[PDB]
A paper describes a structure:
Here, we describe the crystal structures of the N-terminal RD and the C-terminal ED of the lantibiotic resistance-associated RR NsrR from S. agalactiae. NsrR is part of the nisin resistance operon. The expression of the genes of this operon is induced by a TCS consisting of the HK NsrK and the RR NsrR. NsrR belongs to the OmpR/PhoB family of RRs.
The structure of NsrR-ED from S. agalactiae was determined using experimental phases from a single-wavelength anomalous dispersion dataset from the rectangular plate-shaped crystal derivatized with platinum at a resolution of 1.6 Å in space group P21212. The asymmetric unit contains two copies of NsrR-ED related by two-fold rotational symmetry. The ED domain of NsrR consists of six β-strands and three α-helices in a β6-β7-β8-β9-α6-α7-α8-β10-β11 topology (the secondary structure elements are counted in continuation of those of the RD). The effector domain starts with a 4-stranded antiparallel β-sheet, followed by three α-helices and eventually ends in a C-terminal β-hairpin. The structure of NsrR-ED also contains such a wHTH motif built up by helices α7 and α8. In the structure of NsrR-ED, helix α8 is identified as the recognition helix, α7 as the positioning helix, and the loop region between helices α7-α8 as transactivation loop as observed in other RRs. The 16-residue long, solvent-exposed recognition helix α8 of NsrR-ED contains four positively charged residues that can potentially interact with DNA. These are Arg198, Arg200, Lys201, and Lys202. The rmsd between the three helices of the effector domain (including the two helices forming the wHTH motif) of PhoB and NsrR-ED is 1.6 Å over 47 Cα atoms, clearly indicating that NsrR belongs to the OmpR/PhoB family of RRs. As a result, a highly positive groove is created by the two ED domains of NsrR which likely represents the DNA binding site as observed in KdpE.
Author numbering:
A (entry chain A): 128 to 224
B (entry chain B): 127 to 224
Amino acid sequence: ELTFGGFTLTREGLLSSQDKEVILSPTENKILSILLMHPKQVVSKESLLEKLWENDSFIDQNTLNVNMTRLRKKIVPIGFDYIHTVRGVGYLLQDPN
Amino acid sequence: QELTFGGFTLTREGLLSSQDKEVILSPTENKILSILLMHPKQVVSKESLLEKLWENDSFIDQNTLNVNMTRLRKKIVPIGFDYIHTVRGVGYLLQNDP
């Protein structure tokens, strides 16, 4: 499993912490997985798309945009507010502490 | 992907796809179907399915299993995966497959 800040992501797409859970689609799962594998690193949109293709998610950039938005809307409510937008660059997974 | 049966493939992330159609399974639905896919053409009792779920990080009870099994079948039967058979009082059976 992938872990970050007390959250665990399972291969089937369960993200959980404490008594909180959300279920991620395969695309949402693969996006979050890539970020969890690169904590505290700025991941450009191009790099994220490349890594998705590496993992058999052959989506385009608008699909990536939509799924990133859906992902964040899903996981912020259970306390995973660690994905930051870097305007014009990409994303950064980082825990303020 | 890798588990496959009856023209369908199940990815680890929960995508069940045929040549024509696909559906996304919840983690519990994924685990249930995976257990049946790993025991094809075998009768799997409810007790056995439950313990195997409990041996793979699930925490549901029998009544929540029934709801999940109904929800699973309502997701996958419409895309042509009608291979889960109920055996009254016994359990479930995954089975040219008919």
